[PDB]
Amino acid sequence: EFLKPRLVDIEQVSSTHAKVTLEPLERGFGHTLGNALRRILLSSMPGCAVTEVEIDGVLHEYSTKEGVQEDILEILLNLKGLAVRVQGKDEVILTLNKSGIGPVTAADITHDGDVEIVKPQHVICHLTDENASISMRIKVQRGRGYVPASTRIHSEEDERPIGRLLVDACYSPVERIAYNVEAARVEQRTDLDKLVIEMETNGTIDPEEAIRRAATILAEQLEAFVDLRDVEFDPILLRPVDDLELTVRSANCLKAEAIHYIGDLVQRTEVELLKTPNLGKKSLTEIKDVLASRGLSLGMRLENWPPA
Amino acid sequence: GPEEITADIPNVGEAALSKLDESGIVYIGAEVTGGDILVGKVTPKGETQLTPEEKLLRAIFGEKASDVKDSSLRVPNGVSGTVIDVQVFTRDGVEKDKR
Amino acid sequence: PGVLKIVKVYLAVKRRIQPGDKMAGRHGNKGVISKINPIEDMPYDENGTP
Numbered sequence: 001e002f003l004k005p006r007l008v009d010i011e012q013v014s015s016t017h018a019k020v021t022l023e024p025l026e027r028g029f030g031h032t033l034g035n036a037l038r039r040i041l042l043s044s045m046p047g048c049a050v051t052e053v054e055i056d057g058v059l060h061e062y063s064t065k066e067g068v069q070e071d072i073l074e075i076l077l078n079l080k081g082l083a084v085r086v087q088g089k090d091e092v093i094l095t096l097n098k099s100g101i102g103p104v105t106a107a108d109i110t111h112d113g114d115v116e117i118v119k120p121q122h123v124i125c126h127l128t129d130e131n132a133s134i135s136m137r138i139k140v141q142r143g144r145g146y147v148p149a150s151t152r153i154h155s156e157e158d159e160r161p162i163g164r165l166l167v168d169a170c171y172s173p174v175e176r177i178a179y180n181v182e183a184a185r186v187e188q189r190t191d192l193d194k195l196v197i198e199m200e201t202n203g204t205i206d207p208e209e210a211i212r213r214a215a216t217i218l219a220e221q222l223e224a225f226v227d228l229r230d231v232e233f234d235p236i237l238l239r240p241v242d243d244l245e246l247t248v249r250s251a252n253c254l255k256a257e258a259i260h261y262i263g264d265l266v267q268r269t270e271v272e273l274l275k276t277p278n279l280g281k282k283s284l285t286e287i288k289d290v291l292a293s294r295g296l297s298l299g300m301r302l303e304n305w306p307p308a
Numbered sequence: 309g310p311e312e313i314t315a316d317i318p319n320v321g322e323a324a325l326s327k328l329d330e331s332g333i334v335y336i337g338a339e340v341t342g343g344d345i346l347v348g349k350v351t352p353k354g355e356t357q358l359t360p361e362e363k364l365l366r367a368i369f370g371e372k373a374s375d376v377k378d379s380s381l382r383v384p385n386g387v388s389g390t391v392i393d394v395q396v397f398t399r400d401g402v403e404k405d406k407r
Numbered sequence: 408p409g410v411l412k413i414v415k416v417y418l419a420v421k422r423r424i425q426p427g428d429k430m431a432g433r434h435g436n437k438g439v440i441s442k443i444n445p446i447e448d449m450p451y452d453e454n455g456t457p
Contacts (some may be wrong), residue, residue, distance in 0.1 A: 038455075039447045060337035060390045062419050148423070159326075162337050178455025198455070310411060333414060346416050381416065389420035397413040405412070 002026055003192070005033065010208055016299065018199050023184060025193035034179035034195050036308075040214040044144050047173040047204050048086055049077050051141040053165045055134070061165055067132025070125050076167050078124040079138065082106060082172070083202040087114040090142045099102035099133035102126065115140075118203035143171030173204035232302055236294060237263035244290045250283055264305070266296045309352045311379070313405075317348040318374035331406040334391045346381040353377050370385040 005022040012018045025033070053076065058065055061073050070078070086092050096109040104127060107120035123132060149166035177199045184192035199207050232238060239262045241254055257276055259265050270288075273279060291298060315325060315332040324345045327338045332348035335341065353375050355362065366373040396405050411416035424430075424440070449457040 042447045043445065060392070060419075062390065063337070064394055142447075150421075162335050162339075176455055178451070178453070180453075313412060313414070334416060340418065347414050367426075381414075383418070387418065387420075389418040392417040392419050395413075395415040397415075399411050402411060 002029075005029075005195070007208070007211065010201065012207070015203045016201050018201075020197045020199070020207050020211055022195040022197075023192075024186070024198050025181075025184070027191075027193065030181040030193040030195050034181065034197065036218055037197065037211065037214050038177050038179055040217050041174050041177050041199070041210060044217070045172055045205065045210060045213070046142065046144055047171045047172045048084055048092075048140050048142045049169040049171045050082055050167055051139045051169055052149075052167060052168055053079060053136055054163055055086050055136040055165070057170075058165070061164060063136070067127060067129045068125050068134060069128050072165070075125050076165060078122075080167055080170070082122060082124070082138075082140075083115040083118045083204050084140055085118065086140065089114065092140045094138040094140060095136075096138070097133065097135040098127070098129075100127055101130055104134060109138075141169065143169055145172065146170055173201045174199060174210065174237075175202060176200040186234055232263055234263075236296065237261070237266070238308070241265065244294070246290060247283065247286060249278070249280065250287060253277075253279065262294075262296075263302065266291065266298060266300050267302055269299050311349060311351045313347055313349045315348050317378050317380060318370075318372065318376060320378070329407060333394055333396065333405075333407055334398070336391055336394065338391050339389070340383050340391060343382045343385060346383060349380050350365060350376040351379050351380070364374075 003024040003026060005025050007020065009021040010019070010025050011021075012212045023034070054070070055065065055075075058072050061076060063072050064242065065072065067074075084092070084094070092112060092115050094109050094112060094115065096104075098104050100107045103123040104125050105121055105123045109117065127134060147169045149168045152166075155166070179195060179197045179198065182194050182196065184190050184194045197211070199210060201207075201210075241260050241262055242251070244262070246254070254260075254265070258271075265287075270284075274284070288298060313332045315328045317325070317331055317332075325348075326372070327334055328345065328348060329335060334346055340346070355375060358366070362373070394407065396407055398404055422445075426440045426443060429437065429439050446457055451457040
């Protein structure tokens with residue numbers, strides 16, 4: 001009994017600005033759909049961003065390179081804005097080398113297999129002398145949200161050589177998005193709503209693919225509502241008792257007192273186990289000695305004891 | 309005697325010596341955190357009575373047998389970051405540092 | 408005299424903004440940040456810029 005919004009009359013203003021239109025909508029669904037889509041698109045849109053770089057002679061971010069006009073920190077901030085589109089890969093290494101006089105942009109990046117630079121006029125540094133060259137390797141990864149360089153530690157699982165410059169990653173192509181509603185031109189119906197969404201991105205992702213991805217994300221999130229329904233650990237412990245190399249006289253005693261696990265023997269205060277028949281003062285000291293050898297002094301206090 | 313600065317430091321594993329050059333200073337740009345070792349300084353201790361225990365200690369280990377104590381600049385806890393510059397200063401007459 | 412050798416090490420750290428930090432204008436208005444809000448949660452005008 002409801003009309004389904006069809007994606008019609010999608011138009012592109014510039015390489016970044018774009019307008020999409022959903023013509024058939026009911027009375028109140030326009031604002032709901034627009035706000036939900038805007039939140040989904042701004043929050044989590046998969047994209048690609050620079051993860052780290054390696055310059056030839058540069059050792060850290062706060063250093064300088066002879067011949068270049070900008071600090072290495074400035075180079076990192078410039079490279080943070082580089083927007084690329086990759087196909088079938090997630091760790092693309094964009095080696096660039098150039099020498100001469102003037103700015104160095106994304107156009108001189110070596111032409112990789114399947115990597116598209118949205119704009120080739122995005123300068124990243126300058127060369128101010130003829131006999132100086134710049135040579136760097138950029139790693140571009142695919143991600144979802146804003147991941148600061150400092151907060152990631154998994155990259156340190158393998159030691160990074162001194163010279164790897166970790167940059168922050170945004171991964172979000174959608175920079176700005178706005179939505180508006182108007183009266184549909186349909187005259188046979190009494191009144192209908194039409195939604196127009198304007199998106200300003202960095203050119204990485206198509207507006208139609210963006211809308212489809214946001215709608216799929218919303219649908220999978222809503223799928224959880226469609227069917228509501230719903231209406232003693234230390235390795236030293238838990239060890240066989242016949243591993244402390246005890247005397248024969250204690251083996252019969254320990255079996256008689258139902259002590260088969262090492263940890264249970266630990267939980268007994270010195271005073272209490274004396275009443276055990278034929279324990280032996282010297283034999284008890286041997287029990288304390290071997291337990292002291294493992295570092296488990298008698299008198300501890302555990303909480304739970306599983307049968308295993 | 310002299311408090312001497314070296315990369316080699318007794319009773320410290322190879323993990324903490326990865327960021328020290330052959331003179332005992334951090335590589336420029338190395339990212340230090342926590343209590344990482346900055347410069348390896350060893351302060352000689354006193355002993356003129358080589359007891360048999362000390363004799364066999366020097367036999368099984370190096371000639372010093374870790375007699376020299378370490379007083380090495382470690383980054384104070386809660387301080388992290390990249391090393392920017394090192395400004396080694398030397399006394400005239402003594403051998404100049406490699407760095 | 409006593410000193411034979413001196414070495415000095417300089418450390419650089421980047422301090423990013425955080426809730427508890429103190430921010431102020433130049434008219435005597437000051438404060439401590441209370442929450443770092445996502446882009447989608449901040450108010451926006453007709454053009455959509457938050």
